[PDB]
Every structure is written in structure tokens, then in C-alpha cells.
RNA sequence: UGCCCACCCGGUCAUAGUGAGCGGGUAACACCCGGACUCGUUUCGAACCCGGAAGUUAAGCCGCUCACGUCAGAGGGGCCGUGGGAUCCGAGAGGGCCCGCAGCCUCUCUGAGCUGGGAUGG
RNA sequence: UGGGGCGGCACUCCCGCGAAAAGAUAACACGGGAGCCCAAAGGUCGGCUCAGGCGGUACAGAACGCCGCCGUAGAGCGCAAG
RNA sequence: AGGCAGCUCGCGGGGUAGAGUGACAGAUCGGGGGCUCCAGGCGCCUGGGGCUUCCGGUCUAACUCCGAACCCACGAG
């Protein structure tokens, strides 16, 4: 069946912490997500300085983590029960993308505690893939795929209801 | 200053505002009168004859006189519409320094005699270019004829009319 | 008001290039061919290339290949009733005729 | 394309084939190109020279003749295959009449010990004179000792690494451990022709 | 045979583009398999690098259709110059006329990839 | 120096315009700059692609971050312009 | 023993006259559609404010997607 590789698969979940400042909070946030993800995160350099919201160019203003096959999929398993009902179809785009955050990351049913570091919220982004994006990302014969090969919103909902038994 | 002072062309155009500071505000502010998009039948226009530049000051006066004549005729929103075509893009400059500095032994004479912006003109470059026009119905061309013609009385240059 | 004798003075469109051929040097085919003595060439400055830019005073003319030095060539051109030599990199040279 | 302002990069650039800036330098310096391009199934080597109607390749060789004219048995897109064809290129190049040229790379990341450096060394060992930086391949990579060493772990994955090819099911007995030994015999085969 | 059909190496640098739809692949080309060693990801085998290679025409690639962009041909319309000369007209501005040349925009219709060097496929 | 003085520097060099599709070409013509700054703002190699806009995510906000789409330069390239 | 103040042919260079402004940079007049906010009147209507789209027009020494006549280089005649 040609549809077996027209299928939609989960890929590269985004684990991003938004703090918007630099110093004395990134370190704890860096290690806080470390045991949540099991991998070493990466700081985010600041974009163009705005002089308000305390943001400057080149200043580390966030923590990002990324998980891959057999790790991204299991990472979703432990965060879904916290926010299974939080899922809204309104957060799904036309390109098979959806992101979901939490006001406070205590909601996760993990082995977390409340140390002196404090408490934080969290932002999570979900990426859906139809096999073959490598051409858009490979070095040679760079090109773009048409909308037909793209992942649509409806099938994205299916791949969330399926394989994850999530609400909506 | 008399209208004969700037009838002909003295040099190139004068357009770039960013290069020419401090332009006095043109007299004309409204360029369209009457019920545009209204139904009209007679299609008479206005045509010039010889080249030259027209000061906005006269045009604004020409704008006013045309309106009153039509306004008293039927109405201002009635089955008529007046639109003036050109815009005072051109700018005139005059060596006014002979007025102030021309009586105190300052750098008088042709010394540093570049012009100074005091007025604007709607430039004419083509033989027989539109200046204004008016749209009416079949029953009021007779009032429209002199209506343009009376306006033409104040224009510096010889003008021509037509019927369409 | 005397004008400055800048080496690129009064060139507001002399070094302007038609938008259809912007970017880095496209015409590699012209460069690869090599000149020898006695050849006749036409100078056409590429504004993009900053190396070996001949002065504007001799643009769009007929040139003669009299020799070679380094990666560049030297060219003889008559302008008035004198003689002059223009040492230039080849990327502003096009064969005559 | 959105109007008269829009400019179009070249067909190759539109298709991402060649870096012109690199090509630019060769043109101005009249460098004779050595092109060890790679594809997912074979290896491509050429010796090019510029001309008006386009580039001219003095000599050319392909992986396909190794399994056809020299009886290559292993993979066609790995290090030993990469080295073998490069050695072939020089022998064609040597009898061609060329002596010196420059490697042309383009879109291959210059990794030490990679396939690209493995290719160029073979031409060097073939006798082709091409100056090269001394951080190229590693000797063990050419014979594929690592591959056979990797193959020697077949006791672990319940099977040999060389899952039989499109035709190696009942026709080609891939011998992953006995890899370097197969290298010399073809190398000996190609050395004299 | 063959030659074109793609490919690698190109020239031309949009008439060759972009976007959508459809068609073609058991070779070629990719997608795609997996990373112990090479190398490598200011995380990740994503990508790159290496080892590969089941599946597969859905991507891409390729061809075709339609759109727009774009080169031309013709038609319609828009707009209009300049050299050469006169005790030519006009006070001037300006204009005609004899001698030589034109082009410009905008709509309609009609075409719209060419080509050198080598290993697959027919 | 459109008498001289006062005025100003058109007195040193640079951008455009003047200036009329070779060059050169005046004005006390017009619109402007320089008497520096950079050990990195320099050389090379490597990697990424901007301004801007759209959709979704806690604090989150038009504009701090994050995930996708478009974006032929509309950013940026030290200092004026080209 | 060639030389070149002219012309012709061939072969090149050009952004000026002009023309265009949805091709940049600006200047500039109006209408239509939609979105948004405010004021008034009886959810609606009117007026005003901001945004978008479409349609139309008016200029550029320091605008040029184009572009002559024309002038110039060289070879041959």
C-alpha cells in the first residue's frame, strides 16, 4: 500500500521553557527540565533587544529541550494525563502543528517535588510528520514539498485521538 | 506679484519636497465637487492651447467662482459634478532678498540670487491638456458652457472648450 | 561649484546594473577563454567586482591584448592622439565583433 | 517570480547542484577539476576541463564497471568502493595524458576519514599528482577492517550485516568478514590491464 | 540497433519561473534502513558523517494540464520625439513644412526550454 | 567677490544633481559629507539567512521565547550620498 | 609611405529627449467593497476615526521597469 508511507507519524516534540530573563533562574530551569526529559537541554540566545520585558540580543532567555524517536513518544505519555482534557482543536494549525503549555508544571503526574528552586509553568509543542521531509532539510537539491504532501489538521486530530486516547 | 511674472518657463521643474524645504501651503484644498458617481449625460471637457505654468492662486479663485455659479444654478449635490484635473506639483521660487536685504547694504544685487519658495503651480507640458471638466445631463449644457467659460476668464492662458 | 574628482564620480547609473543579472559573477564562460597577444577586446566594467576596476574614462571601448601579467591582462587603447596601457583582470573584457 | 524586479538564480542553483563561488575560483585560475561526486548507490569520479559549449571531461569512471569489468562483490557506496574507483580514475587519467588537477567537492562536508578523502587517495596512489592536505582518510578504512570488525559481531544480531542484495539472495555470496582480502585481488586485477 | 529518457559534469541564465492537478518508475534517482567504528550534533544519527539497504511513485525528481509571472509575434488602444535648412509663420513662447530616423506604454490573440561532455533505461 | 566693506567660503578632499545617453565641461547653483572610527568593525574557513507578515502555545503582551507557513532584499552591511 | 579633418558598412558603448508610476523611491486626487472604533438618532440607521481590497486620475534635476534620434570606439571599405 502506498498509504503506508503517506501515513502521519510523531516527531521532534519541543520542550521549551519561557523565562524571558537571564540569570539565577535559567540554571534551576535547566536542571529542572533535565530530569523531566533525561537529556541535556540548550539555552536560547535572545533575539533583537526590546529594552522592555528585559530582553537583549545574545542573552540566554530560555531553555529548550528536544526529544526524538522512542523518546519523544514516551515523553508525551507522561505529560498527557496532566493535560488530557486541556487539548483543544483550536490549537491545531493547517500544517499538522499544535502546541500546549501549562501555567504551573506541578500538574504533571511525575516524581517531582517542591524544592527550594521553586515552581514553573511549561510550554510543549507537538510536531507531526509525513515521511519525506528530509528533502526540505537535506543539503542537496533543496526544495519544498507541496501542500498535498503536508499533514492536514484533521489527520492530526486522528493521530492524537489514536495512539494517545486523548480528549477531543 | 503679477501673474505675468511666472507665465513662461524659467528652467527645469521643481518637485522634490525633501530637497526643497518650506513650501507655502497651496490655496487649493478641495479638488472634486458635486455628486460624483452620479448619472450624467453631457461630457464636456476643458482644453488649453499654449504652454505655460498656472499659479494655484488663480486656480483656487477659479475653483470658487465655478462652484458659486453652479451652486446658485440648481444645487451643490444635484445632477452635476466638478473635478479639477491638475495639481500644483510645480513650485516657483523668487529672489525676495532684494526686498528685505535690498535696503540695508547687505548682499544685494544678483549676489546669491537663487530663488525662494513662495508659491506652487500646476505644470502644463502637453499641447491641449485637461485642466478641469464637468459632467451634466442633456438639459443643462447651456449653463455649463459659460460655467467653464467664466472660469476660463481668470486663467492666464488661452483656453478651449468642447462638447461630448 | 567645481565637482570632486572622485574615482567613481558622476556614475549614478554608469555602475547601475540591469536587475536581470544581479548577484555574484554569472558569466564564467567569458572568463575561462584566454587571450594572447594581438587580440582585440571590448572593455565592459562589471560594477559588482571590486577587483581591478578600470577607471570610467575608458569604458566601452576597443582594446588590444599586448601581454599578460599575473591573473590579469594589460590592454592598449587609443583615447586621443596618445597611447595608454590598462592593466585589468579579465572579468570586464568581451571579445570584439 | 513576482514581477520585473524578481531575479532568477541559475538552474543548478535552483536545483542545488553546484556552488558557483567555488566554480568561480577554478575558472579564474584555470584549474582542471577533479570531481568525486557520490550517489546513494555508486561512486562518481571525473576529470573536467572548461570549454565554450560547456565543461569537457578528459576521463571518467564509475562504480558500475567494478562489478562488471572487475567483479566487485561488496557494496558500491562504501569506503572500499570509494577508494577502488579513485584508483581506477588515475589509471584512466594516467594514460589519458593529464598529470595534475584539483579536487572539486561542492556539497560534501570535508570530514577526515570520509568517503571523499578515501576516493582521492586512490587516485593519488594510482599515480595521479594532486597536492592534498595531510588530514585525509585512515588506512584501515580503505580495506574496510572496521566493516569486517563490525561484521564480526554477527553473533549478536542473529544474522550477517550484508542482508543479501537485490540479486545476492542466491547469486552473490556476500562475505563481510573476508572483505579486505577481496580488495587486493581486484586491486591486483586492476593494477595490470 | 538506434536515438531520446532521465542521471552525473555543464553552457545559455526565466520563452527555461512560481503555484496547483495528474501521469511515469521494479534500471537509473530519491524516498527510505541503521548507526558499533569515521565524523558529528554550544540536545538529538533531525541534519551532517558512516554502514547500509526492506519498502515505495506518496514526496522530490520527471512528464503533462491550468493558472499566473516572463520573451516574442500580430492586432487594438495610449502617448509622442529628434537630427538637417531657410531675411518661413508667430512679438514671444510656439508651430507648420520640405531632407533622415524613430521608439514608448497599455489591452486582445498566438507561441514559449535550448544546448556540450560521459556511465544507466527504452 | 556681479564696486569695496560687512556677509559667507563656493580656498583642502568626497556623493548626487546640475551636465544635454563618448569624454571634458561654468555658477557666491541645489541637496549633502570628511579632517574619523575599528585588534576588531581586519584575513581566512566553516555554519545560518534578513525586514516584515500569518496560524498555535502560561505567565505571553502588536512587539521578550517556542512550533509551523510566506516573505527577490522591501533588513543589514561603522560614519553623508551614490 | 603612409596619414586621416568626412562618409558607408560591420561590430560595440550609452540612460538624455520621451514614456511609465501595481517596477523601486517619493508627491498627489477620488470613488467602491469589506473589517474595526467613536458620536448621534430610532438591534438598526446616520456621521466621524483607523485598517484592508478593488477601480480611476494627477508629477518628479537629485525615481527609472523601458528608451530613441543622437554622439562616440575599432576594423574594413
Author numbering:
A (entry chain AL5P): 8 to 175
B (entry chain L10E): 4 to 167
C (entry chain L21E): 2 to 98
D (entry chain L18P): 2 to 194
The authors write:
The ribosome is a large macromolecular machine that synthesizes proteins in all living cells. We present 10 cryo-electron microscopy (cryo-EM) structures of the archaeal ribosome from crenarchaeota Sulfolobus acidocaldarius (Sac) at 2.7–5.7 Å resolution. tRNA and messenger RNA (mRNA) translocation through the ribosome, catalyzed by the elongation factor aEF2 in archaea (known as EF-G and eEF2 in bacteria and eukarya, respectively), is an important and complex step during translation.
We observed a helix-shaped structural element stretching from the 50S subunit association interface. Moreover, during model building, we noticed the lack of density for H68 and H69 of 23S rRNA based on the starting model of the Hma ribosome 50S subunit. Additionally, H71 moved 8 Å from the original position. This suggests that the stretched density is attributed to H68 and H69. Furthermore, the density map showed a flexible upper part of H68. This result suggests that LSU is incompatible with 70S formation in the current conformation. In contrast, the large-scale movement of H68 and H69 in the Sac 50S ribosome prevents the formation of these inter-subunit bridges. Consistent with results from 2D PAGE and mass spectroscopy, we identified the density and built de novo models for three bona fide r-proteins (aL45, aL46 and aL47).
